[PDB]
Amino acid sequence: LHKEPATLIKAIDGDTVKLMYKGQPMTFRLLLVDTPEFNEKYGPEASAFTKKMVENAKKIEAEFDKGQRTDKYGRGLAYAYADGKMVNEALVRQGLAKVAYVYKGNNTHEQLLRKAEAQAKKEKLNIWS
C-alpha cells in the first residue's frame, strides 16, 4: 500500500473525516474500525480524539487498501495518517474504537489493529472499562 496526500476540510466524528483528496472534497470512513456514534457512550470522546489528531497534523495522508475504495454511501475507505501516525490504529489502541467491518481483501492492517485492541483491552481503556 501507499500513502497519498490529502488535506483536512473538517472533522466529522470518531471514524469519519472530510478530506480534500486529489483536489475534491470527500467524506472518508476509516477502515477496519467502529467508533461509537456521537450520541453513544464514548462517542464524544472518540470524536474529540480524531478531531485533535487530524486538526493538529501538519500532514494528513490517506492510504487505500487493495479492495473497494468507496463504500455504498460514497465515502472513501482508507487508513488515515496524521504526521505518519495511523488514526485508525490510534483510536483502537486508546479503547475509543473496536476493530470491525473486516471485509475480505480490504484488510491489510487487520492484525496490526487487532494487536492494538488486545492491548487496550488489557489496559481496560475507555470502551473496555
Ligand SMILES: Cc1cn([C@H]2C[C@H](OP(=O)(O)O)[C@@H](COP(=O)(O)O)O2)c(=O)[nH]c1=O
Ligand atoms: C467501515 C465500512 C463500512 N461500510 C458500511 C457497512 C455499514 O452499512 P450499514 O449502514 O448498512 O449498516 C456501514 C457502517 O458505517 P458506520 O459505522 O459509519 O455507520 O458502512 C462498508 O461497506 N465498508 C466498510 O469498510
Ligand SMILES: [Ca+2]
Ligand atoms: Ca460508527
